[PDB]
Design a protein around this ligand. Structure first.
Ligand code: FWF
Ligand code: KAI
Ligand code: KAI
Lengths: 73, 342, 138, 48
């Protein structure tokens, strides 16, 4: 409110009053959560984790080939 | 004169109705109930299908009642035996008997599953690309193994064995754990029947009949959630409303599952057990109402049909009839057996 | 011969994995099983005594019934010793409470749903409704 | 209700007891309670 206005005290007591009787909580829960988009099962396998395991396996095989090469020499 | 509308399986046409005339051409739940009421009260009756083909409503413009209720008020029909939901506006004009059947507003959606597990479900915990990749990786390990031997002391063979064993260990542990996740998630009863869950999500569009007590329930509802859903259904194009129940179900089946249909729990219970079992009912009922036999106001039939409905209810004729036209002829079966199967 | 042993090994691996998974589920969820599925199962089994209030529309429902199962239940309840009937609902619930589980109580779904949420909460409702009625203002 | 009953018809005395009894015999204007709707009660009094 503008300085020295007649509305300052009334709006102050207004915000306080509306806060104590729980209206603000109601409006907050109204416009944020209650109207929200995001609120079973669906569990499924993951190719990419096991793929990482494939990476460690291939690493093992490469090291194996190099070790074979150094073993022969 | 008994006025009624054709709705399944309340009033249906026989396989050959062409050679059949009178009350013998119609068959259904409402037909049987009609015969029983007429038996107890001892009156001769002729079933006639209502011309306009509506249940009942009051036009705001001309303020004239239509349908069953319409034919009832103006004296065109002596009694109306049909699936008529008891409402305030209808009770004000005409008298309703004690309700014979109890129903509620329910949601019908496409079935997520094909009705049974299979061999391929063994390959579920580990994806197909992972199968191809593990076989491929296996043959890679094999060719490396062959390349090691050239023409208990070693390095290359040791690390191949170790890495392969570690690999298959982690893989089979993943298989086991993921299968445990599958079965644990299959064992969960929860969540079942969450209220308002549709109201939040925008992924699935839902609709009701064009004219009926459901859409009207949404209209006058001051309740937050239903007001939200009605505000949604009112402003959505293409029109989310359907003309007939059959059209609604056929809309759900051809919608791939992105559409939900709000209808009466009875019609839902009926359609759910019909071949090829495409649809299921989800969530608890939004409200509780009941069907009732409607008689004109001040009629002599009101008290006898009331007492008749009560008498038939207490001796369990109604239950027998419902189980007769719903679950006993059901081709899909399942239902409670499916609940035990879950 | 090596392929026999290998394939057998893969097979048994799959099986033991499946078993372990299932048992893991079983131990995780822990869903208790109700002794009595439905009302007909009470008619099929002799052991657990079940009863209604001394005077009420429920006992009236049991006395006059033409269906086989209820007829049998009522033919059971009529002749029994000691008498299975109770005077008040509280006495019935308490009789379910001092039971050890050998007594079943037949009561309208409302009072049942109400008692299920009331301390100690030991009681619960099982099986569908035997009939569907409603309260009214007279 | 004085006697502490809902309602019944004794075959011997043919008299209604309880709230139903108070309703038929005019000792009470209206009955509001968990009163099970039954035919025998609907014959004597009006249920909503
Ligand atoms: C218009 C509303 C006041 S209402 O629909 O009547 N009641 C609302 C309330 C939630 C409700 C809803 C449904 C029922 C209800 C329950 C059962 C039945 C059938 C099985 C017959 N019951 S009966 O009328 O008592 C019988 C002895 C014939 C019919 C209606 C009872 C109460
Ligand atoms: C089947 C129809 C269209 C009727 C029957 N009772 C409700 C009524 O009397 O309005 C309607 C159901 C509904 O609108 O889903
Ligand atoms: C609790 C009592 C005695 C009442 C309540 N309703 C039923 C009635 O209105 O008769 C009775 C229950 C019963 O009969 O099991």
């Amino acid at each position: 409110t503008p300085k020295g206005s007649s509305l300052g005290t009334p709006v102050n007591l207004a915000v306080l009053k509306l806060s104590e009787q729980g209206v603000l909580d109601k409006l907050k829960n109204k416009w944020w959560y209650d109207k929200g988009e995001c609120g079973e099962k669906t569990s499924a396998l993951s190719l990419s984790n096991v793929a990482g395991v494939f990476y460690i396996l291939v690493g093992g095989l490469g090291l194996a080939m190099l070790v074979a090469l150094i073993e022969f020499a | 004169v008994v006025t009624t509308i054709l709705e399944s399986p309340y009033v249906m046409m026989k396989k050959n109705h062409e050679m059949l005339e009178g009350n013998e051409r119609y068959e259904g739940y409402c037909v049987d109930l009609a015969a029983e009421i007429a038996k107890h009260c001892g009156f001769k009756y002729k079933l006639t299908i209502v011309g306009d083909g509506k249940y009942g409503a009051r036009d705001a413009d001309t303020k004239i009642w239509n349908g069953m209720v319409g034919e009832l008020v103006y004296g065109k029909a002596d009694i109306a035996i049909a699936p008529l939901t008891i409402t305030l506006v209808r009770e004000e004009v005409i008298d309703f008997s004690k309700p014979f059947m109890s129903l509620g507003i329910s949601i019908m959606i496409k079935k997520p599953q094909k009705s049974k597990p299979g061999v391929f479900s063994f390959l579920d915990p580990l994806a197909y690309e992972i199968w191809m990749a593990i076989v491929f990786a296996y043959i890679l390990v094999s060719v490396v193994l062959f390349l090691v031997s050239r023409f208990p002391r070693s390095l290359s063979a040791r690390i191949v064995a170790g890495v392969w064993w570690f690999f298959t260990l982690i893989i089979i542990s993943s298989y086991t754990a993921n299968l445990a996740a599958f079965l644990t998630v299959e064992r969960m009863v929860s969540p079942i029947e969450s209220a308002e869950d549709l109201s939040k999500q925008t992924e699935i569009a839902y609709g009701t009949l064009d004219s009926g007590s459901t859409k009207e329930f949404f209209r006058r509802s001051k309740i937050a959630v239903f007001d939200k859903m009605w505000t949604y259904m009112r402003s959505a194009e293409p029109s989310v409303f359907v003309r007939t129940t059959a059209e609604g179900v056929a809309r759900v089946r051809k919608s791939k599952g992105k559409y939900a249909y709000l209808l009466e729990s009875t019609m839902n219970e009926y359609i759910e057990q019909r071949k090829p079992c495409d649809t299921m009912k989800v969530g608890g009922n939004l409200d509780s109402k009941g069907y009732g036999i409607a008689t004109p106001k001040g009629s002599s039939l009101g008290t006898p049909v009331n007492l008749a409905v009560l008498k038939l209810s207490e001796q369990g004729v109604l239950d027998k009839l419902k189980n007769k036209w719903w679950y006993d002829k059901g081709e899909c079966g399942a239902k409670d057996s499916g609940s035990k199967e879950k």
